Amino acid sequence: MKEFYLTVEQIGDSIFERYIDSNGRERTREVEYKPSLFAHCPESQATKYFDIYGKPCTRKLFANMRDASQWIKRMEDIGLEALGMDDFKLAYLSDTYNYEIKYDHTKIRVANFDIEVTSPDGFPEPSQAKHPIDAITHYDSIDDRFYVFDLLNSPYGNVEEWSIEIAAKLQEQGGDEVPSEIIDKIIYMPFDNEKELLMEYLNFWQQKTPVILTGWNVESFAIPYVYNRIKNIFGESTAKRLSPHRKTRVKVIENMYGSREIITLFGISVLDYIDLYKKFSFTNQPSYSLDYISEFELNVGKLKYDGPISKLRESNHQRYISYNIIAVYRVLQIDAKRQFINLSLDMGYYAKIQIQSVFSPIKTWDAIIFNSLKEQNKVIPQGRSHPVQPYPGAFVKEPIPNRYKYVMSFDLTSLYPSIIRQVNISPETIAGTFKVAPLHDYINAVAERPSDVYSCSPNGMMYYKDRDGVVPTEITKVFNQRKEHKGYMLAAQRNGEIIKEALHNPNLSVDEPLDVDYRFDFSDEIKEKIKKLSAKSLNEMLFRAQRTEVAGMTAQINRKLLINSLYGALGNVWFRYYDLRNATAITTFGQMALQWIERKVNEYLNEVCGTEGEAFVLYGDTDSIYVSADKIIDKVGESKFRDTNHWVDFLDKFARERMEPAIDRGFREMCEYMNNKQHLMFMDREAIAGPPLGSKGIGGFWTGKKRYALNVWDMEGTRYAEPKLKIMGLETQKSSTPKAVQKALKECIRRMLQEGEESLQEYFKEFEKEFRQLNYISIASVSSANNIAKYDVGGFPGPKCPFHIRGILTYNRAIKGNIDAPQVVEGEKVYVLPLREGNPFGDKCIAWPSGTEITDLIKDDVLHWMDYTVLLEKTFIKPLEGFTSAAKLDYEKKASLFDMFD
DNA sequence: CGTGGAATGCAGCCGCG
DNA sequence: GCGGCTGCATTCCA
Structure with missing residues (x-):
């Protein structure tokens, strides 16, 4: 090989x-x-x-x-x-x-592990590793086995061995429900003392040194802990055996108001799945713990247990080990997915x-x-050094806060990589400059043509049109590769159909599966060759046919990832090919482009609707634009449409047959105007939104930049059976919004866009009437507490102490003198609730850890003094008021008309 | 070391018979 | 008493 x-x-x-x-x-x-x-x-x-x-x-x-x-x-x-x-x-x-x-x-050894460290005090700091490691589950991809190391005796208790039989059983049976898929892949190794455990692990580690080391937070916890635990018990040279070249190095990282150290192991590649996730998930979650992510990805998280984790080993060592095993596996499953x-x-x-x-x-x-x-x-x-000099970026149109019934959004394809290609921007293609006119004079096409010899950009940068740029060439290559791979796919999907006929018209003759390249399109000498073929072996010719297609799909994704991660590099001073003038050229061009098309699309929709100067384009944003189709519908009549799906087709037809041609003509003029090396500005219809035909519901609404909501039916040719709400920027995406509320908000929005004012009112009046009867954890606002002691002057709020940092104070006091009380750890999130005056707590609010219920030490009173009015008003009413105001609707009858003023 | 646009919760001022 | 502004906090469109 x-x-x-x-x-x-x-x-x-x-x-x-x-x-x-x-x-x-x-x-x-x-x-x-x-x-x-x-x-x-x-x-x-x-x-x-x-x-x-x-x-x-x-x-x-x-x-x-x-x-x-x-x-x-x-x-x-x-x-x-x-x-x-x-x-x-x-x-x-x-x-x-x-x-x-x-x-x-x-052949690549991919290790996946997690450890358990019983700790009475707080979180066991890895740099100190003050406590014994009482468990280690290490999965090896080459052996496809989970290696478990169990500490039987430690200063925190002496336990019996872990039962695999019991681990396999059902919860209701007193078992741990460890999946049948890994139950036979487990290798249990109990130990009498920790030194015996650590030294055996380190030995195993030499026998199967990982190439790729993964896990959840394994780089900020697992690795540093094990390393320091060993360095302190045995010497440093022994700890260095974690590295196949016996070389390590401590690195320092300053995140917020403090730092953390990780251990670098020469000869190993650490890909901590938490970092891997955050970078390639492209789905910002409110919490990045394994339990949250696993639940969100796998529809099930980490095992459940009673009492505090720091006492789980002493109370139920069986579940403790199984919890360890399942932790490693949960990560393996998420990878089975996201890959x-x-x-x-x-x-x-x-x-x-x-x-x-x-x-x-x-x-x-x-x-x-x-x-x-x-x-x-x-x-x-x-590599040259450059001063971090911030430059202009994407243009974002200030929208007129209002409701919009019919909308059509359009987007440009890979705008930035495209502009680099079209203008031919690269450090060695810089040809010269030219007297720059106001950006607007370029958008309205009234400025002098930059030049008739060089490809240009609105910031005054001119590039050679002849020579091929290093950067542009390289992007193009990747673009071309992404295409040649879709080719190996959209084909391995058809060549797989000529093989799918295994039972449609089966044959016989028992022999080895036909030898052919499933990638490249089949041959006629092979198409006629699959006649006298066994229907049984014919299946393997579909295993590769289906395999190749996926192999292809798992090819473009990587290419688009590169394509998308280019501008950043190029805009990053530490980049070899960085250049401030080039970055500004790319970016300023984008602005001209987005506003030039805006003009065109308006000029056109006016010269087609008869109007004189209507603002069809209600919003823009970097590479996309949103258009109002109201005028276009009224130009035919809503009554002239059978159903909703009827006026939807109308717009779609209109966009493809009228808009696109308009847009392309327009962009072509711009390319000629800027004398670019090649026309690459391409827009595509994205969404089509509107209310249900014959419904008092409004289209959608825009609060402000980055803040709006639409009711979409067709997303890029894909018609939905049920319209999907496309809420952007609003408080429904705000993790800080309590469930009950954030939920009630989406339903408020939905009723607004598909049902109308009256419906919304009916809901609001209902929700308020049934608010007290809602769970206190559900109607609580979540917040992350950073730098608490900075505003903690002896148990009381300091220099303008934040609302969420205040309640923490009222909490630290109410339970001051109790270890059984859930401790609010710095750098974590907490639940917050307001309190009515006269409360036996001191402050007007109290906050405790998240995912946990208030300690039974002060739970009763909290649930008796939580200010219900203040709570709703701040998290539901106040923000809904934001939506209804812009949408021009009332969520409460008899409201005032003069409120809109003063 | 992967770059610009931008939209709020509170928390304290200041300005007025 | 509440109306402007400003404190950076923190998140999110591209």
Whole structure:
């Protein structure tokens, strides 16, 4: 098989690499890699190397990376550019694997673990690791086994062994309900003392050293804990065995008002699934704990248990171990879904970099570009330093707060990557500048044409139209790849149909499954060849037919990820190809583009509706625009439509046959106006919203920028059986809104958009009448408490102490002198509730930890003094008032008309 | 080290017979 | 007594 790398590290003058050799066996090797950097040389000197600017460079082959680094230093002291890949691991990787990397994940050891540390005090700080590790479940992808290490005796109790039989049983049976899929994949290992446990684990760890290390928070907890626990009990060199090259290093990170340390293990790639999630989930959740995410992704979280976790081992050691096992597994399941590990591997090997760098847009693109330029003997620019100079971004139209009955949204395809291609923006394509006129003079097409020789941008930047830019070329390549892969898909879906006929018209003749490439389209000599084929073996020809299709789908996703993570890199000063003028060129262009089309779409909808100067475009936002179709409906009559689905088709037909052509004509003019290298501005109809035909409901409403709601029926050609509410920015997406409320808000909105004023009123009056009878946890506002002691002057609010930080004070007091009371930990979230004066608590509000009910020590009184009026008014009424005001509706009859004023 | 647009809860001032 | 503003807090469109 092809030979690929697992991990690479540079340890002072040496390259340590773990890799899969030609026979599939894992290997590790040390190499005194000889790096090569480049310097500019005179034309007289003949070479095959030139920088991206065409200037000739002489190649310099150093004896060791140290010398190379030393050289770069001297070059900075003289003031001369030092071209070449400064990251020697990348270079080494480029040379050792100069060909499309093809790996077999089946040979890559992916470890997934979690630990348990019984702690009486607070959270057991990893940097200290003051308490014994009483459990470790470590899953190995190569063996597909869960290795459990159980501590039988510790200063916190001596327990019996964990029963697998009991673990398999049902809850109602006194069991732990550990799934039947992993019940036979468990290997239990109890121990008498912790030293015996740690040393056995560390030993197992040498036998099956992970290549990829994952888990939930394993990088900020698990790893540091185990490492420090071992370093303190045994010495530091023993703790270093966690690294296959016996090298570690502590890193420091400052998040908010404090810091945390992680341990770097040379020779391993740590992809903490919590970070992996946050980066590729693209679904911001209110809580990122495994229990929340697992419940939200798997529809079931981590096992349940009674009493505090710090006492679970002493109270029910059986559930304690099972809870540990299930924790590891829950993460494995989420991955069975999102497949973010694979997403990392295939992405890392594409760019040819350390898998853990998949977290950096910069590192990935620098790696991708470096490899391209290298193939054509070109030398990359020297990483230069740049002052963080904020530049303008996307244009967002200030909407007129109001209701909108019919709406049609349109979006531009990959706006930023597109503009880079169309204008041909790149550090080496800069040709010159030109007298810049007010952006508006460009949007209304009244400014002088920038130039008739160079591709231009509204910020005054001019680019060569002939030469191919380095950046643009590279994006285009990825775009072209995403396409060639949809091709391997939209085909492996049809070639799979000519095979799906296994029972439709089966045959016989028992033999091996037909040998053909399911990817590339089938042949006629093979289409007629599948006649005399066994219907039994015919199934395997569909396993690959279905496999290839997915293999394709799992191909474009990665490509769009790169495409989308380019502008950021390019806009990031630490990027090799960064350039402030280019970033502003891309971005300012986007603005002209979005407002130029706005004008066109308005000019057109007026010259089609007869109107003189109507504002059809009610909102814009970076790359999309929302249009009002009201005038278009009235131009035919709502009565002239059978049902809702009838006026919907009308608009769709109108957009594709009238709008698109208008839009494209328009954008083409702009391309000619800016004398761009190529027309790439493409819009597509996105949504179509409106109220149910013959219903007193309003279309939707806009409160302000980024804040609105629509009732959509057709999203990009996809008609819904039931209209879906598209609420954006409103308080329904606000995690801080108590359930009962945030719920009641969506229903308030729905009634507004599909039923009308009167319906909304009926609901509001109902909800208020049935508010007290709602659960106190449900009607409570959630908040995260940061920096509490800063406003805690002896148990009381300090310098303008926040509302949520106040209640924490009233709480810390009410339970001051109790360890059984749920402790409110800094950096976490808490429930908040107002209190009526005269309350035996001191303050006007109280807040306790989240996901937990108020301690029975003060629960009774809290549930007796919580100010119900103040509560509703602030979380329901106040925000609904925001919606109804903009929508021009009342949520309460007899309201005042003059309120809108003063 | 992955870049700009922008929309509020409170918490305290200041300005007026 | 409540009407302007400003305190950065915190989240979210692209």
